[PDB]
Amino acid sequence: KVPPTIAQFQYTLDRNTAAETFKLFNKYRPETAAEKKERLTKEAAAVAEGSPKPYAVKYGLNHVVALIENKKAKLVLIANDVDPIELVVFLPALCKKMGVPYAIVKGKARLGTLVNQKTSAVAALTEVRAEDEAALAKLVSTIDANFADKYDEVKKHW
Amino acid sequence: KKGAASNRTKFVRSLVREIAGLSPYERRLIDLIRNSGEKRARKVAKKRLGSFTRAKAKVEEMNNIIAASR
């Protein structure tokens, strides 16, 4: 059978909780290439003739890992079907050691749809507007009981 | 220069220690430590390793892991 570290996946966010997380994440889609290009062209045209940081989800594996271990990230999403499993084996344990809540979601393809990329294998959010801060906090609190308390014996099931 | 501790690297190594569990030879070594003594554990490690210093360091690492386990 698989080692105890493996099979920690296959226990993931449920349809309701996953749908809620996607709905919350869908409100922070990062600016795509076309949107950024048109915005910059409009700004240049305005300048030629004569705002705070843009809140967005963090999805880069290196960027997400750097955010973790610094307590900046408030929530982290983990892809379960990552082909190089070694890239993701340490992420759950590292987050638990750092105390950062995380929720595993099935499908790297599904995860990537929220950032206009084919696959990202990871997703996280640090900045959040006031209108969504309460929703993010409630989702984080719910995820605790949904996952951590339901799989306290994840070390079993070789 | 010298190999500074680099606390970040120490934490990463400690986390990897738990993530990777123990190798089957490491499992045998710790089982013999808990049931056959560090005296025999060091000899087993030396038979399964090179210089005696490396075996002693490994035995110390296993002892530290056992102590941290409880």
């Binding site: 059978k1 105890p4 570290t5 271990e69 307590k71 344990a93 638990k96 050691k97 750092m98 105390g99 014996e153 070390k155 079993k156 070789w158 | 400690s14 986390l15 220690r17 738990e18 569990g21 089957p24 499992r27 892991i65 941290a68 386990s69 409880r70």
Partner: peptide, 15 residues
């Protein structure tokens, strides 16, 4: 050979 893992390190949250 087949025993549960131990959270000796992950038990304490980083401050």
């Amino acid at each position: 050979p087949y025993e549960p893992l131990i959270d000796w390190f992950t038990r304490h949250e980083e401050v």
